[PDB]
Write a protein that binds this ligand. Sequence first.
Ligand SMILES: O=c1ccn([C@@H]2O[C@H](COP(=O)(O)OP(=O)(O)OP(=O)(O)O)[C@@H](O)[C@H]2O)c(=O)[nH]1
Ligand SMILES: O=c1ccn([C@@H]2O[C@H](COP(=O)(O)OP(=O)(O)OP(=O)(O)O)[C@@H](O)[C@H]2O)c(=O)[nH]1
Ligand SMILES: O=c1ccn([C@@H]2O[C@H](COP(=O)(O)OP(=O)(O)OP(=O)(O)O)[C@@H](O)[C@H]2O)c(=O)[nH]1
Lengths: 242, 242, 242
Amino acid sequence: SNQPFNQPNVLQERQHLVNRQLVQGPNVQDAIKRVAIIFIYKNGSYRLIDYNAPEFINGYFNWRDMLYMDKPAHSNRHKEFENQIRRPDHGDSHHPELFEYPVAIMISANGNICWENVRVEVENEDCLNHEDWRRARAWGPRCYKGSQMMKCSALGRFLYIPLRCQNESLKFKFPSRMSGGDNRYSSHSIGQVIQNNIIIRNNPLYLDNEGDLIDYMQAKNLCYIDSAAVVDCNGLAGDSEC
Amino acid sequence: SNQPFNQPNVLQERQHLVNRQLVQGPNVQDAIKRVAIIFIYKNGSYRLIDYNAPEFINGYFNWRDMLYMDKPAHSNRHKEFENQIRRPDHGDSHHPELFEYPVAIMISANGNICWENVRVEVENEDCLNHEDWRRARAWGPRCYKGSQMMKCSALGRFLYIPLRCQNESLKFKFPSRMSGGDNRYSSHSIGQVIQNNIIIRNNPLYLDNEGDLIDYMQAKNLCYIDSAAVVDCNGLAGDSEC
Amino acid sequence: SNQPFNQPNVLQERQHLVNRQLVQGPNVQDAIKRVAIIFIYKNGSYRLIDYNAPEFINGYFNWRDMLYMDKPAHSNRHKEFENQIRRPDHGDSHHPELFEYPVAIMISANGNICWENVRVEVENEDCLNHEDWRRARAWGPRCYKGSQMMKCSALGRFLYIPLRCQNESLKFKFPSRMSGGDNRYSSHSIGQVIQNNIIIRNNPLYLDNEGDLIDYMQAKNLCYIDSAAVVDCNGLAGDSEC
Ligand SMILES: O=c1ccn([C@@H]2O[C@H](COP(=O)(O)OP(=O)(O)OP(=O)(O)O)[C@@H](O)[C@H]2O)c(=O)[nH]1
Ligand SMILES: O=c1ccn([C@@H]2O[C@H](COP(=O)(O)OP(=O)(O)OP(=O)(O)O)[C@@H](O)[C@H]2O)c(=O)[nH]1
Ligand SMILES: O=c1ccn([C@@H]2O[C@H](COP(=O)(O)OP(=O)(O)OP(=O)(O)O)[C@@H](O)[C@H]2O)c(=O)[nH]1
């Protein structure tokens, strides 16, 4: 007799592990986490700031950092508006709003992130969470938390923030999960955590429309929910029906 | 009989606690600390940089960071002056001094700060505290300390630094006090300290004159001693005579 | 009798200790470490960024940070090129290469540095070490290590990096050695390490030619190997033949 039906089936498995690798890769300690801060402007276009780090992504946008471009030609206008906002009434500023101050923020946070410890806070013009610094803290009662970000998958969550005023700024923290109960802020591991956490702030990108934006998010595999509330990217691997 | 003289006196106490709150609020762990770095220029006006953080405010101004505005129209002039200063004699620079290099620094430090551990250092053109980097350290023997800052109150101290040259830069550290003997750089607390310490550097503000400056310091409740050595703001709460 | 041949010989020793001081000075804990990142451009000139810190020098250059000057007059060109590079094909960019993107990097690292823990990595256009962020880590398999930097002396090593493409960026880490087996990331010492590590990024300097560059490196006593592979500066003290 003879048994010729021994076609190997390792290929299926190799591809399968490549698929799992993309989903589990982010969960290895010192794997990269990736956050996209996306501002929407009055011209309907976007400015996207891409962050990555292996321990935690924190940072801020002061009031000035919120603006669309802030070119030399508009520096005086922006200076005076900033004066009026951050020190009324000392700005030679003649309009209630700037064309270049955003109308909303979208945040795509991706990776092995401790959602419980995530903080996203819309601060005032001095980047504080209280009117008086003497009552301000690291984070306040109006802070956004991880569970408030819309879940796209196990890898990514997405937050929408309307800006109904033009005096606000932004402060955020997206920290890694540890490996089980191993706190790497222990003496064994903390030196490496501190020295490895180089928080990359890539130069802001300008995207004309939401089609181009969806394309970017899908290209970089960062989760995105479009203006119609449809999840177009969730950070996960491609697959066919099970 | 009847006892109609029972007018409540809780109101006095409520206001009183609001007053104490502003003075004690800064002393809660993870309360915000606030520092204003103020440069004075040859046009008699000011450039103010507002910092806040919950663990410690450190940072620096390299030589270029010292300048008033540094607009594109003056970029070449400033580049060449920087060359001559930081690498003599390689600058096509034709004047001993720049109009836009400051003549003095004022620092208003406010909050629950460990004054013993405060460091403010006027560095050389390479932002080092010795002529030769091989003898330079984190801090040097000419470093300003907390006790050298003029005390305005329990909440705030104020330092004046004359700049008699135009080759100097700045490095500083304003760290929080701990709660008694609880070192939060212990393994229990340090992760939070590190991830919470997002040092906000607000965009520099331009203030025309000292009247406008006093107004700002009083509005933001940051301590200030004016050019006549009078304490105009001390970070404390308003009150009537005791 | 009389013994008039008692000419003192302390002077020799005083100078000798001054010489040793420059070589050993960097090895005191909290002594400064100094790193020069030097880019070479298509006009044959250099842009040098001078860093110093007492605990560790880490940082990065995102893609935009790589460019020579990036003046307002060339902002549009640079924006569009960045678009095409970081999000193809969304840049209105008409040339394969920019005049202002560097052709090589030279890194002079100097001081009491733990060469074993040094990391210098040429990242892609998103400043990641893998094509897909989900497989990216703090550092990757193509990372440069301390032993790959050409040794100039006990104080300094020098690395050359050719840039054969124009999509790459940079991330680096140069950490201090500890005093023997005393890990200052222990609870006793870590607060000071964290608060003292103010990583100075001096404004980029523009140097016309290699003669001017050699002069700078020798003036600042940072190690340098010239285009002919000759060590012109090694960070050590001057001396006569032994
Ligand atoms: O960030 C921005 C940028 C531009 N702009 C808008 O650009 C326009 C350019 O200014 P104008 O076109 O109105 O010229 P102008 O000299 O009359 O300016 P003002 O009298 O208003 O000072 C201004 O009217 C302003 O509203 C903003 O409001 N915000
Ligand atoms: O930061 C600054 C800004 C401006 N300035 C001053 O602005 C003035 C503008 O320069 P000028 O008005 O003298 O024109 P110019 O072409 O003659 O310039 P030079 O011959 O001096 O190169 C210069 O004389 C300079 O002293 C500074 O010195 N420092
Ligand atoms: O970073 C830089 C800076 C300058 N340049 C170069 O400067 C030159 C200035 O551009 P041109 O002198 O070609 O004028 P132009 O209006 O024809 O520009 P294009 O048609 O090429 O858009 C361009 O040809 C560009 O190649 C760079 O390529 N990269």
